[PDB]
């Protein structure tokens, strides 16, 4: 019943003391933190506490949208040699640093996921040519579904896939995705392997990655310019912003101290130094 | 006019949205439907119907009528498999083309129990006892009855009742398995071995066929709708 926006426990006025009770003495061998408050050690007056923990609630701590990835696509001229650039990105929070570390404060989580799409385009070649306002399809390809090989192949029919046709210039795109995990919680860290190396099998056949569950965990997004070739080249950058809503978490873990290296927990050399120089007897 | 503020997402078209929109033919007299026999309400309903499995997919037997026939014989008893099959209904060539798999090919995740049914198709006079077994994953796929017999199985006796059913009980680490080949969501192994042997009297065809069927169970479900690969349009 104690909500987030509740006033914190008050400070009780306590006077001088000379008794056989020892708030001050403990033993951190027990693993337990000694739970004291100012009054326990020094004389205090009465204080009606006003501050609340309101903002520090798990839900509020993740209430911000965050850039997960930057997908780049383009629409070149018809005569061109290179193909029209259409991107495919494996949906994961671990491509960027910020949001990841925040999510790493715990062992597991559940959250309905909100994605936002900020598209931004421009020309590239020195020319005064023209491009009419461009549209963009963002097709979510769940694991196993046919990944588009061309920018104009059958896959874009999306008879079952959930897509979003964004018209450039209008407000950023947004879609809601519930907790879609195969487990009873999303796993930030997975101490194990997908395969088991059997003895009646060759090492190769039984080998897999350390820390990985399913290579394809959530699927890929596919983004393409819908409008056809235009004599003047136009490149586009779609920025995805994720805001984890309705979030729950379990078992806290120490926050990442050294820079990330790969999708794993691994650390690169040359970054193994986080704390600076400070003399013990210097304030 | 009522003061409003446009929010993120406006003007965007979700292929999976569910909004109201204007009608092209206002006041259209719709013809009433009639009681057309056999109405379906859910895809799973079709999944629970038994469908014949193209087991033997050899280059010479694939894409033909021979694929569904698993031929047994009166050869002396051995411990070597008649048929092996991996539980990955939507990704194993054999299962992936049965009703179950097809429906499964439209979803990302599947869960529940499955049941295989084997139909003997020999002469009345032919007898025998076979063993169909489902071994959960995480170990060596059996190659001898000795191992297979250590898992989940049914010992089937061929007789007046021609069909036997072995249920594959939903035993998995995750609440839902991927509809694609994946180690993390692996399914295990389905195997069939001769319990005794096939015995036939004189003047009797010494070899015959068995037909396999598969179907989901009342507890089975599928989620996260997706596009299938079992079809395409080249240009």
């Amino acid at each position: 019943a104690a909500t987030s926006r509740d006033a914190l426990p008050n400070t009780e006025a306590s006077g001088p003391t000379h008794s056989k009770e020892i708030p001050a003495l403990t033993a951190v061998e027990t693993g337990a933190t000694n739970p004291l408050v100012p009054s326990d050690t020094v004389q205090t007056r009465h204080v009606v506490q006003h501050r609340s923990r309101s903002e520090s609630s798990i839900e509020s701590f993740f209430a911000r949208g965050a850039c997960v990835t930057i997908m780049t696509v383009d629409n070149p001229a018809s005569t061109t040699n290179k193909d029209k650039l259409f991107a495919v990105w494996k949906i994961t929070y671990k491509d960027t640093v910020q949001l990841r570390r925040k999510l790493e404060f715990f062992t597991y989580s559940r959250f309905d996921m909100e994605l936002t799409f900020v598209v931004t385009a421009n020309f590239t070649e020195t020319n005064n040519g023209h491009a009419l306002n461009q549209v963009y399809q963002i097709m979510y390809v769940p694991p196993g579904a046919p990944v588009p090989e061309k920018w104009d192949d059958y896959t874009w029919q999306t008879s079952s896939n959930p897509s979003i046709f964004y018209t450039y210039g209008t407000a950023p795109a947004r879609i809601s995705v519930p907790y879609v995990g195969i487990s009873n919680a999303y796993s930030h860290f997975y101490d194990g392997f997908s395969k088991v190396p059997l003895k009646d099998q060759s090492a190769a056949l039984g080998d897999s990655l350390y820390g990985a569950a399913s290579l394809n965990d959530f699927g890929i997004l596919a983004v393409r310019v819908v409008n056809d070739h235009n004599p003047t080249k136009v490149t586009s950058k779609i920025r995805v912003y994720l805001k984890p809503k309705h979030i729950r978490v379990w078992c806290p873990r120490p926050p990442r101290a050294v820079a990330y290296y790969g999708p794993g927990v691994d650390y690169k050399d040359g970054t193994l130094t986080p704390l600076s120089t400070k003399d013990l007897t210097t304030y | 006019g009522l003061p409003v503020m446009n929010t993120p997402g406006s003007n965007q078209y979700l292929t999976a949205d569910n909004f109201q929109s204007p009608c092209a033919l206002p006041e259209f007299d719709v013809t009433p439907p009639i009681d057309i026999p056999g109405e379906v309400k859910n895809m799973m309903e079709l999944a629970e119907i038994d469908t014949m499995i193209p087991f033997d997919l050899s280059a010479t037997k694939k894409n033909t009528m021979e694929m569904y026939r698993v031929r047994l014989s009166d050869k002396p008893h051995t411990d070597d498999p008649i048929l092996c099959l991996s539980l990955s209904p939507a990704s194993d060539p054999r299962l992936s083309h049965t009703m179950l798999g097809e429906i499964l090919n439209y979803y990302t995740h599947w869960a529940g129990s499955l049941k295989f049914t084997f139909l003997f198709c020999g002469s009345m006079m032919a007898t025998g006892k076979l063993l169909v077994s489902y071994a959960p994953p995480g170990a060596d796929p059996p190659k001898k009855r000795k191992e297979a017999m250590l898992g989940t199985h049914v010992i089937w006796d061929i007789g007046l009742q021609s069909s036997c059913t072995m249920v594959v009980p939903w035993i998995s680490n995750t609440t839902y398995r991927q509809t694609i080949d994946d180690s993390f969501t692996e399914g295990g192994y389905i195997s069939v071995f001769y319990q005794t042997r096939i015995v036939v009297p004189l003047s009797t065809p010494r070899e015959m066929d068995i037909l396999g069927f598969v179907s989901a169970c009342n507890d089975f479900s599928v989620r996260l709708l997706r596009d299938t690969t079992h079809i395409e349009q080249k240009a």
Partner: nanobody, 120 residues
């Protein structure tokens, strides 16, 4: 648009050697593996060999052991399959399956493949 395009041909005499290459693009998130697969004329698709992300740690298939060599050049973003001692069993199509992996089985990107023929 992770474009995987094989090259290397396939029309050698029995016993020779070929260099099977594969141009990779798009976004190959290094970490994982990069490999080779063969379908054969009339058999099931079979795993040939897999090499680690950037690491030159690899394995080979029992059938091909030592007679095939799979490396990489992540500077050139390519993988190579040198094949010495080609034989009548090696006659087949080869595919550069280099994406995700994590092992020697999982994929989200394949190539168009190329045929090899060891004649004699």
């Amino acid at each position: 648009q992770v474009q995987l395009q094989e090259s290397g041909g396939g029309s050698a005499q029995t016993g020779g050697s070929l260099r099977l290459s594969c141009a990779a693009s798009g976004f190959t998130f290094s970490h994982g593996y990069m490999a080779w697969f063969r379908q054969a004329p009339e058999k099931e698709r079979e795993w040939v060999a897999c090499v680690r992300t950037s690491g030159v740690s690899a394995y080979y298939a029992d059938s091909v052991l030592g007679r095939f060599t799979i490396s990489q050049d992540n500077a050139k973003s390519t993988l190579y399959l040198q094949m010495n001692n080609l034989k009548p069993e090696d006659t087949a199509m080869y595919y550069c399956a280099a994406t995700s992996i994590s092992c020697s089985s999982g994929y989200m990107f394949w190539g168009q493949g190329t045929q090899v023929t060891v004649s004699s």
